[PDB]
Amino acid sequence: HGSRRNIVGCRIQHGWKEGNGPVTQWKGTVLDQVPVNPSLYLIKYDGFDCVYGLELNKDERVSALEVLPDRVATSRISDAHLADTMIGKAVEHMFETEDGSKDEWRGMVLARAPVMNTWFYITYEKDPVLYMYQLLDDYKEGDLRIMPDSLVGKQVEYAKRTGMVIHQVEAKPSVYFIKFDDDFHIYVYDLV
């Protein structure tokens, strides 16, 4: 009935059209495939640090999906001990604004990212979606300071809106990834 190759670990490009807007072009890297919903992929789009969830084969807003011949480089971590003990910790993450002023955001390092092995999954208190950064390099730069059964498959309802729990964070088993309807962000909540 039709068999194709898997796209996890591959870089892709596709067109995007929402509403009466024009078709825009995008490049990205497919990070993983959700077990409790294999149609849902986690993608890191070129030039942005949020991890997004899209059904790249069923979403009618997607067009001209192609797989690139690019091979994501398998670099070596410059500091395995720091990379290992940093996971699961609360952090202060320094960012830079327009005027050059510095914003500092409370976050938590969740895990090492797949496919891009020098990047880290991280979420923030005032922005609880899934982010990806090369945290070891910010740490050396001095912009990162470190501080001292599964619900996957269930649905969660919030009043601000329904989503599904798609992943349990290993280092913090009460923290889960949630994919909400009609929102391509991956939310990171503590479900207690």
Which parts of this chain interact with ligand 6P9 (CB under 6 A)? Answer: 16, 26, 45, 48, 50, 52, 54, 93, 95, 105, 124, 127, 184
- Distance, in Å, from the CA atom of 26 to the CA atom of 38, rounded to the nearest integer, reads 22
Strands 120-124 and 162-168: unpaired
Nearer to ligand 6P9, 26 or 189 (CB): 26
Nearer to ligand 6P9, 95 or 158 (CB): 95
Which of Cl ion, ligand 6P9, none does residue 106 bind (CB under 5 to 8 Å by kind)?
A: Cl ion
Pure H helices in 35-122? 80-85
| 25 sits in which H/E element | strand 24-33
Per CB under 5 A, 145 contacts Cl ion: no
Q: How far is the CB of 8 from ligand 6P9 (least distance, A)?
A: 17
Q: How far is the CB of 74 from ligand 6P9 (least distance, A)?
A: 25
Per CB under 5 A, 105 contacts Cl ion: yes
Per CB under 5 A, 126 contacts Cl ion: yes
Nearer to ligand 6P9, 143 or 151 (CB): 143
